[PDB]
Design an enzyme around this catalytic site. Structure first.
Site, PDB file in Angstrom:
ATOM      1  N   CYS A 160      59.337   0.647 -58.150  1.00  0.00           N
ATOM      2  CA  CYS A 160      59.592  -0.102 -56.921  1.00  0.00           C
ATOM      3  C   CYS A 160      60.161   0.841 -55.879  1.00  0.00           C
ATOM      4  CB  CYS A 160      60.528  -1.270 -57.209  1.00  0.00           C
ATOM      5  SG  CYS A 160      60.866  -2.318 -55.776  1.00  0.00           S
ATOM      6  N   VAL A 161      59.556   0.823 -54.698  1.00  0.00           N
ATOM      7  CA  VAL A 161      60.128   1.534 -53.553  1.00  0.00           C
ATOM      8  C   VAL A 161      60.505   0.479 -52.531  1.00  0.00           C
ATOM      9  CG1 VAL A 161      59.547   3.079 -51.610  1.00  0.00           C
ATOM     10  CG2 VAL A 161      58.936   3.710 -53.962  1.00  0.00           C
ATOM     11  N   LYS A 168      55.640   6.812 -47.809  1.00  0.00           N
ATOM     12  CA  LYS A 168      56.299   8.079 -47.542  1.00  0.00           C
ATOM     13  C   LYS A 168      56.173   9.015 -48.748  1.00  0.00           C
ATOM     14  CE  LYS A 168      59.529   5.978 -44.296  1.00  0.00           C
ATOM     15  NZ  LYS A 168      58.527   5.552 -43.292  1.00  0.00           N
ATOM     16  N   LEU A 170      57.119   8.565 -51.757  1.00  0.00           N
ATOM     17  CA  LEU A 170      58.258   8.506 -52.655  1.00  0.00           C
ATOM     18  C   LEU A 170      57.830   8.134 -54.084  1.00  0.00           C
ATOM     19  CD1 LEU A 170      61.209   8.963 -53.051  1.00  0.00           C
ATOM     20  CD2 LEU A 170      61.693   6.738 -52.025  1.00  0.00           C
ATOM     21  N   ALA A 171      56.844   7.250 -54.228  1.00  0.00           N
ATOM     22  CA  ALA A 171      56.409   6.838 -55.564  1.00  0.00           C
ATOM     23  C   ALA A 171      55.987   8.069 -56.385  1.00  0.00           C
ATOM     24  CB  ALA A 171      55.338   5.772 -55.463  1.00  0.00           C
ATOM     25  N   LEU A 411      55.914  -6.660 -69.845  1.00  0.00           N
ATOM     26  CA  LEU A 411      56.763  -7.610 -69.132  1.00  0.00           C
ATOM     27  C   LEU A 411      56.621  -7.466 -67.610  1.00  0.00           C
ATOM     28  CD1 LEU A 411      59.875  -7.074 -71.372  1.00  0.00           C
ATOM     29  CD2 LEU A 411      58.156  -8.891 -71.545  1.00  0.00           C
TER      30      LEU A 411
HETATM   31  C1  MYA Z   1      54.771  11.226 -70.417  1.00  0.00           C
HETATM   32  C2  MYA Z   1      55.594  10.412 -69.446  1.00  0.00           C
HETATM   33  C3  MYA Z   1      54.693   9.900 -68.279  1.00  0.00           C
HETATM   34  C4  MYA Z   1      55.515   8.844 -67.473  1.00  0.00           C
HETATM   35  C5  MYA Z   1      54.785   8.451 -66.187  1.00  0.00           C
HETATM   36  C6  MYA Z   1      53.495   7.742 -66.452  1.00  0.00           C
HETATM   37  C7  MYA Z   1      52.836   7.294 -65.140  1.00  0.00           C
HETATM   38  C8  MYA Z   1      53.591   6.078 -64.494  1.00  0.00           C
HETATM   39  C9  MYA Z   1      52.824   5.525 -63.304  1.00  0.00           C
HETATM   40  C10 MYA Z   1      53.563   4.349 -62.654  1.00  0.00           C
HETATM   41  C11 MYA Z   1      53.218   3.019 -63.347  1.00  0.00           C
HETATM   42  C12 MYA Z   1      53.903   1.839 -62.600  1.00  0.00           C
HETATM   43  C13 MYA Z   1      53.707   0.501 -63.304  1.00  0.00           C
HETATM   44  C14 MYA Z   1      54.353  -0.613 -62.484  1.00  0.00           C
HETATM   45  O1  MYA Z   1      55.585  -0.711 -62.411  1.00  0.00           O
HETATM   46  S1  MYA Z   1      53.227  -1.625 -61.660  1.00  0.00           S
HETATM   47  C15 MYA Z   1      54.215  -2.405 -60.372  1.00  0.00           C
HETATM   48  C16 MYA Z   1      54.258  -1.537 -59.136  1.00  0.00           C
HETATM   49  N1  MYA Z   1      55.288  -2.065 -58.202  1.00  0.00           N
HETATM   50  C17 MYA Z   1      54.982  -2.804 -57.140  1.00  0.00           C
HETATM   51  O2  MYA Z   1      53.840  -3.137 -56.856  1.00  0.00           O
HETATM   52  C18 MYA Z   1      56.182  -3.230 -56.318  1.00  0.00           C
HETATM   53  C19 MYA Z   1      55.843  -3.264 -54.799  1.00  0.00           C
HETATM   54  N2  MYA Z   1      55.341  -2.017 -54.308  1.00  0.00           N
HETATM   55  C20 MYA Z   1      56.048  -0.907 -54.229  1.00  0.00           C
HETATM   56  O3  MYA Z   1      57.216  -0.870 -54.562  1.00  0.00           O
HETATM   57  C21 MYA Z   1      55.384   0.333 -53.705  1.00  0.00           C
HETATM   58  O4  MYA Z   1      54.199  -0.073 -52.977  1.00  0.00           O
HETATM   59  C22 MYA Z   1      54.918   1.333 -54.814  1.00  0.00           C
HETATM   60  C23 MYA Z   1      56.109   1.964 -55.517  1.00  0.00           C
HETATM   61  C24 MYA Z   1      54.057   0.604 -55.885  1.00  0.00           C
HETATM   62  C25 MYA Z   1      54.084   2.438 -54.187  1.00  0.00           C
HETATM   63  O5  MYA Z   1      54.869   3.072 -53.185  1.00  0.00           O
HETATM   64  P1  MYA Z   1      54.249   3.238 -51.721  1.00  0.00           P
HETATM   65  O6  MYA Z   1      53.317   2.128 -51.466  1.00  0.00           O
HETATM   66  O7  MYA Z   1      55.419   3.443 -50.893  1.00  0.00           O
HETATM   67  O8  MYA Z   1      53.327   4.531 -51.775  1.00  0.00           O
HETATM   68  P2  MYA Z   1      53.726   6.107 -51.811  1.00  0.00           P
HETATM   69  O9  MYA Z   1      53.371   6.663 -50.431  1.00  0.00           O
HETATM   70  O10 MYA Z   1      55.109   6.285 -52.216  1.00  0.00           O
HETATM   71  O11 MYA Z   1      52.759   6.714 -52.927  1.00  0.00           O
HETATM   72  C26 MYA Z   1      51.365   6.541 -52.850  1.00  0.00           C
HETATM   73  C27 MYA Z   1      50.776   6.966 -54.189  1.00  0.00           C
HETATM   74  O12 MYA Z   1      51.265   5.988 -55.172  1.00  0.00           O
HETATM   75  C28 MYA Z   1      50.137   5.552 -55.922  1.00  0.00           C
HETATM   76  N3  MYA Z   1      50.424   4.183 -56.383  1.00  0.00           N
HETATM   77  C29 MYA Z   1      50.499   3.059 -55.637  1.00  0.00           C
HETATM   78  N4  MYA Z   1      50.841   2.024 -56.392  1.00  0.00           N
HETATM   79  C30 MYA Z   1      50.960   2.504 -57.654  1.00  0.00           C
HETATM   80  C31 MYA Z   1      51.279   1.907 -58.882  1.00  0.00           C
HETATM   81  N5  MYA Z   1      51.540   0.609 -59.033  1.00  0.00           N
HETATM   82  N6  MYA Z   1      51.330   2.678 -59.967  1.00  0.00           N
HETATM   83  C32 MYA Z   1      51.106   4.012 -59.859  1.00  0.00           C
HETATM   84  N7  MYA Z   1      50.782   4.649 -58.731  1.00  0.00           N
HETATM   85  C33 MYA Z   1      50.720   3.864 -57.629  1.00  0.00           C
HETATM   86  C34 MYA Z   1      49.029   5.550 -54.902  1.00  0.00           C
HETATM   87  O13 MYA Z   1      47.742   5.443 -55.471  1.00  0.00           O
HETATM   88  C35 MYA Z   1      49.297   6.878 -54.212  1.00  0.00           C
HETATM   89  O14 MYA Z   1      48.849   8.017 -54.962  1.00  0.00           O
HETATM   90  P3  MYA Z   1      47.492   8.763 -54.489  1.00  0.00           P
HETATM   91  O15 MYA Z   1      46.498   7.702 -54.559  1.00  0.00           O
HETATM   92  O16 MYA Z   1      47.750   9.221 -53.059  1.00  0.00           O
HETATM   93  O17 MYA Z   1      47.156   9.846 -55.484  1.00  0.00           O
HETATM   94  C1  NZB Z   2      53.295  -6.465 -65.971  1.00  0.00           C
HETATM   95  N1  NZB Z   2      54.277  -5.862 -65.073  1.00  0.00           N
HETATM   96  C2  NZB Z   2      54.123  -4.406 -64.801  1.00  0.00           C
HETATM   97  C3  NZB Z   2      54.418  -6.593 -63.785  1.00  0.00           C
HETATM   98  C4  NZB Z   2      53.257  -6.553 -62.833  1.00  0.00           C
HETATM   99  N2  NZB Z   2      52.979  -5.652 -61.883  1.00  0.00           N
HETATM  100  N3  NZB Z   2      51.829  -5.941 -61.180  1.00  0.00           N
HETATM  101  C5  NZB Z   2      51.374  -7.131 -61.656  1.00  0.00           C
HETATM  102  C6  NZB Z   2      50.253  -7.947 -61.328  1.00  0.00           C
HETATM  103  C7  NZB Z   2      50.067  -9.099 -62.118  1.00  0.00           C
HETATM  104  C8  NZB Z   2      50.934  -9.499 -63.148  1.00  0.00           C
HETATM  105  C9  NZB Z   2      50.692 -10.707 -64.019  1.00  0.00           C
HETATM  106  C10 NZB Z   2      50.739 -10.506 -65.387  1.00  0.00           C
HETATM  107  C11 NZB Z   2      50.478 -11.585 -66.226  1.00  0.00           C
HETATM  108  C12 NZB Z   2      50.144 -12.800 -65.647  1.00  0.00           C
HETATM  109  F1  NZB Z   2      49.947 -13.787 -66.557  1.00  0.00           F
HETATM  110  C13 NZB Z   2      50.041 -13.061 -64.297  1.00  0.00           C
HETATM  111  C14 NZB Z   2      50.284 -11.961 -63.453  1.00  0.00           C
HETATM  112  O1  NZB Z   2      50.249 -12.057 -62.128  1.00  0.00           O
HETATM  113  C15 NZB Z   2      49.865 -13.250 -61.456  1.00  0.00           C
HETATM  114  C16 NZB Z   2      49.753 -12.910 -59.987  1.00  0.00           C
HETATM  115  C17 NZB Z   2      51.062 -12.593 -59.331  1.00  0.00           C
HETATM  116  C18 NZB Z   2      51.374 -11.247 -59.078  1.00  0.00           C
HETATM  117  C19 NZB Z   2      52.614 -11.050 -58.464  1.00  0.00           C
HETATM  118  C20 NZB Z   2      53.494 -12.077 -58.169  1.00  0.00           C
HETATM  119  N4  NZB Z   2      53.167 -13.369 -58.417  1.00  0.00           N
HETATM  120  C21 NZB Z   2      51.961 -13.613 -59.009  1.00  0.00           C
HETATM  121  C22 NZB Z   2      52.014  -8.747 -63.434  1.00  0.00           C
HETATM  122  C23 NZB Z   2      52.223  -7.568 -62.741  1.00  0.00           C
HETATM  123 MG    MG Z   3      57.163   5.929 -50.161  1.00  0.00          MG
END
Ligand code: MYA
Ligand code: NZB
Ligand code: MG
Length: 411
Positions: A160-161, A168, A170-171, A411
């Protein structure tokens, strides 16, 4: 097109995906000693922070970031509102690693600006069944079986950002630092899910909803009265009739799970999950943590026949904030968790799930089409929603599998 994801060890295209025949790492191997010991450089106005999950203030800070800035539906009508008790549960399983919870704070005032969390999971992630068959035919059985053993990896969640800091880059910084902290513990794979399409899923499934309180769902515009219900003199009364449930479970033998059930639930769950290509392995401690009832967070019931647990189901609660309704502030959603049926058809076990959820004041029950969730969609009146949950690995080549081959609930 992907300035960050192009630099990372994940399949870059569906084509690359389609040429993957064996499970295994993407990257040539690295070592602990190779990893920088110091956090990734960050702007002098921000600082890295490792929250203390034993501290109420730390949990509250995380809670507030996510309440205001976490995942919304595609129409910005609903935003997940994970509780503080849920976050403590999700973030602190047995043997969790405090250093895998990574945050960025603003130095001046300690405002939490960004968060990402990793937790341990033991995952079966070897070559899938359909691909092992293909391999046997190619005389390529040994390579296909190389990574069959359950692996101790990282499960990533809660990225989450803050809204003011979006776009920016940050992700990526968060993801790189999380990767570093995980790699420093000699873990080199992660599993994660998202609703958005990134390079490149190994499985994708539609999500589904089952109305429990249709009057409220209609009021907050989660649901509409479907146009077919117009032929009726009275659309709504018909809608409640359609989704009505019994007051009490129909399986005698159903009761809430208690600690003494942990060994039996572990056995029946582990036996069931073996039918699936990708899935977690849980110790008794992990079964306790993820399945014992916790008020407002997770709800688990067993069917016990002749003093033997033969079936169980679990669901967890995630309320959503309803952005801007004069009558309701919250959507109280139940999400199907793990389950196992040995004595009764799955539809009959999960009907009890819907009955309990409804009794306990939930508005809707949700699930992704993983596990055997498709078998009860029609009879239990689930409807497909507007999107998909996508499953991903970091640093793991994996052939495409159907979601009905996935047994990890995220979750
Ligand atoms: C071995 C250990 C490994 C551990 C790490 C394993 C990998 C973990 C990976 C993370 C798994 C997370 C699982 C969950 O929690 S999924 C839930 C994600 N959270 C949200 O949707 C909450 C609301 N949104 C936000 O907080 C922001 O929009 C986020 C943080 C999502 C992006 O921030 P922002 O919008 O300010 O953008 P940026 O300018 O900083 O960055 C842009 C770059 O970010 C890439 N991007 C966008 N969304 C996602 C996303 N959901 N997974 C991975 N990457 C994502 C995007 O393609 C682009 O890269 P590129 O396309 O330019 O290349
Ligand atoms: C699983 N973690 C990483 C959370 C998470 N991150 N991105 C997600 C997108 C979908 C769901 C999701 C998963 C199961 C389900 F039965 C319904 C769901 O979404 C209904 C639509 C919605 C989305 C967002 C808010 N309200 C409704 C979870 C997500
Ligand atoms: Mg950012």
């Amino acid at each position: 097109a992907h300035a960050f994801w192009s630099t990372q060890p994940v399949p870059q295209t569906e084509d690359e995906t389609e040429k993957i025949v064996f499970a295994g790492p993407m990257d040539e191997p690295k070592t602990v000693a190779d990893i920088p010991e110091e956090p990734y450089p960050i702007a002098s106005t921000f600082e890295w922070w490792t929250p203390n999950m034993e501290a109420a203030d730390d949990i509250h800070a995380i809670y507030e970031l996510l309440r205001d800035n976490y995942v919304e539906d595609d129409d910005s009508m609903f935003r997940f509102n994970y509780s503080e008790e849920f976050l403590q549960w999700a973030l602190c399983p047995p043997n969790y690693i405090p250093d895998w919870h990574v945050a960025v704070r603003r130095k001046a005032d300690k405002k939490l600006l960004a968060f990402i969390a990793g937790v341990p999971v033991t995952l079966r992630m070897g070559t899938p069944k359909y691909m092992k068959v293909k391999a046997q035919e190619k005389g390529e059985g040994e390579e296909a079986a190389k990574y069959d053993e359950p692996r101790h990896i990282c499960e990533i969640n809660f990225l989450c950002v803050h809204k003011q800091l979006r776009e920016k880059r940050l992700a990526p910084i968060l993801i790189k630092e999380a990767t570093r902290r995980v790699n420093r513990t000699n873990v080199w794979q992660a599993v994660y899910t998202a609703g958005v399409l990134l390079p490149t899923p190994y499985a994708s499934g539609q999500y589904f909803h089952r109305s429990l309180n249709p009057e409220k769902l209609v009021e907050i515009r989660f649901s509409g009265i479907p146009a077919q219900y117009q032929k009726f003199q009275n659309p709504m009364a018909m809608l409640k009739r359609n989704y009505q449930l019994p007051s009490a479970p129909k399986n005698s033998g159903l009761r809430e799970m208690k600690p003494s059930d942990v060994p039996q639930v572990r056995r029946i769950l582990m036996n069931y999950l073996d039918s699936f290509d990708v899935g977690p392995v849980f110790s008794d401690a992990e079964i306790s943590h993820y399945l014992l009832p916790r008020d407002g967070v997770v709800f688990t019931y067993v069917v016990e026949n002749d003093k033997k647990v033969t079936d169980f189901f679990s669901f967890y609660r995630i309320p959503s904030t309803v952005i801007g309704n004069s009558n309701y502030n919250l959507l109280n959603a139940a999400y199907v968790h793990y389950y196992a049926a040995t004595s009764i058809p799955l539809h009959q076990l999960i009907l009890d799930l819907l009955i309990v959820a409804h009794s306990r004041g939930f508005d809707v029950c949700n699930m992704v089409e993983i596990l055997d969730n498709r078998s009860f969609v029609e009879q239990l009146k689930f409807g497909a929603g507007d999107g998909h949950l996508r499953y991903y690995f970091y640093n793991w080549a994996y052939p495409k599998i159907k979601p009905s081959q996935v047994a990890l609930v995220m979750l």
